């Protein structure tokens, strides 16, 4: 983009209903830092998401030490705040023709005075508002950097944001390795006798596992059963008689060995 928003007044671009491509943002070497908190930084492709908030502003370069969640600082307690249980990625890279320019860059402002601390994800709108002079034979962390915030929320909703992978035809009555919007797991799948409400996605048990999903492109509902297992037990006489054995499978019948 041509012009961004300030750390005083920032910009919130709500992003939904599109196919993401994080890898092209990952492999391109145009970034000073790439720190994904709560999610592994290369596993960005496989998990499918509900809502995306693109949050862009600019900052003093040493204050990328203070952009971390939980970390205190004059941007953290006054200007821009993350929760402690934040997940997502913050990406910052240098700006020496990008946001650095002459005229100062006094379009972008920072508030240094406030009489309290902040609520996370808040935009607040002596005189408390100032704008830096970007001069690096002082700090090269007194340079402005393009910082961006990719906040995520984990799956509890209709997921609509994920990457470039290709789906496949399903199957039934065979233990497979499934994947639904990022939910992995094993087991067997069958048709649902259970009627389903037209706003949910997930059947969860008492035992905190998933028994019922719906295909995110087909309104059929499937039941999840973990494919059968059992204890392995051996019947034998003593070794001082023979070496013939007897094999016993616990709690499952012989049609599946």
């Amino acid at each position: 983009a041509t012009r961004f928003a300030s750390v005083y007044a920032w910009n919130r671009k709500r992003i939904s209903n599109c196919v993401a491509d994080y890898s092209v943002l990952y492999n391109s070497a145009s970034f000073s830092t790439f720190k994904c908190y709560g999610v592994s930084p290369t596993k960005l492709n496989d998990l499918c998401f509900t809502n995306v908030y693109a949050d862009s502003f600019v900052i003093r370069g040493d204050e990328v030490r203070q952009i971390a969640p939980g970390q205190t600082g004059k941007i953290a307690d006054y200007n821009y705040k993350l929760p402690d249980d934040f997940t997502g990625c913050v990406i910052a890279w240098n700006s020496n023709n990008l946001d650095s320019k002459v005229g100062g860059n006094y379009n972008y402002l920072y508030r240094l005075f406030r009489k309290s601390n902040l609520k996370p994800f808040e935009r607040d709108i002596y005189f408390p508002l100032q704008s830096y002079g970007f001069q690096p034979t002082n700090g090269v962390g007194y340079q402005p950097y393009r910082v961006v915030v990719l906040s995520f929320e984990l799956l509890h909703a209709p997921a609509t944001v994920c990457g470039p992978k290709k789906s496949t035809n399903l199957v039934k009555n065979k233990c497979v390795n499934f994947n639904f919007n990022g939910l992995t797991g094993t087991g067997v799948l069958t048709e649902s006798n259970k009627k389903f409400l037209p706003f949910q996605q997930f059947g969860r048990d008492i035992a905190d596992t998933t028994d019922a999903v719906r295909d995110p492109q087909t309104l059929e509902i499937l039941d999840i059963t973990p494919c059968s297992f059992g204890g392995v037990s051996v019947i034998t006489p003593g070794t001082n008689t023979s070496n013939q054995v007897a094999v016993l499978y616990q709690g499952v019948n012989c049609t599946e060995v």
Partner: antibody
């Protein structure tokens, strides 16, 4: 001291080639663009080229394309300007032109200048 | 267009004010706000004096000033001193760096 020292100048013949360079000191050379701006003796100013730190984005002038090639080395804080097919109108004092740190001046403007070297293309 | 139009020379009395035009095109001057002014002593490199026509960099005295409307920039130097006697160059960057024709300021002594 922010300082730019040109190298590679001399007196060459038309039809031959030459390679210039410029060493940087006093500033982080990897974070700001350097340019070549040429000036014939007693005449006006004329920009030549620009190189990026990743080595992908380069822009040349209209009397420059197809002959002159700029490159840089961010580790050694120097650069190069590979020049082939030299003509006598290219005879100019060549300046490696970048920006220092103390200024708010960006890299597309021209604050930090070099001392220059003379390239003569004559037979 | 190819070379920005400047007066070849501007003569002015010392201590007075002179105005030096930088006439370009709409694709060169009126497109963006990125117009510069460059003082070049003979036998030395150029030196920046004006960015973004309104303001000045660090170390530049307030005698240097600019005005732009449409497609013509106008460097204004009030209080001419003998150390301002050099070559003057204006440059614009919309997609490329286009310099000016050259202007020799002559401080009358």
């Amino acid at each position: 001291q922010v300082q730019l020292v040109e190298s590679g100048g001399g007196v060459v013949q038309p039809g031959r080639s030459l390679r210039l360079s410029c060493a940087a000191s006093g500033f982080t050379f990897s974070n700001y663009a350097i340019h070549w701006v040429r000036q014939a003796p007693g005449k006006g100013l004329e920009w030549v080229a620009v190189v990026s730190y990743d080595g992908s984005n380069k822009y040349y002038a209209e009397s420059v394309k197809g002959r002159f090639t700029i490159s840089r080395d961010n580790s050694k804080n120097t650069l190069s300007l590979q020049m082939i097919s030299l003509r006598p109108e290219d005879t100019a004092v060549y300046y490696c032109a970048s920006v220092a740190d103390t200024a708010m001046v960006p890299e597309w403007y021209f604050d930090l200048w070099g001392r220059g070297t003379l390239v003569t293309v004559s037979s | 267009q190819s070379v920005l139009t400047q007066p070849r020379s501007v003569s002015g009395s010392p201590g007075q004010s002179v105005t030096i035009s930088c006439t370009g095109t709409s694709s060169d001057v009126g497109a963006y706000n990125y117009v510069s002014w460059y003082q070049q002593h003979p036998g030395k490199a150029p030196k920046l004096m004006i960015y973004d026509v309104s303001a000045r960099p660090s170390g530049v005295p307030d005698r240097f000033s600019g005005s732009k409307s449409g497609n013509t920039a106008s460097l204004t130097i009030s209080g001419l001193q003998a150390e301002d006697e050099a070559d003057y160059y204006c440059c614009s960057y919309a997609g490329s760096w286009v310099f000016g024709g050259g202007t020799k300021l002559t401080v009358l002594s």
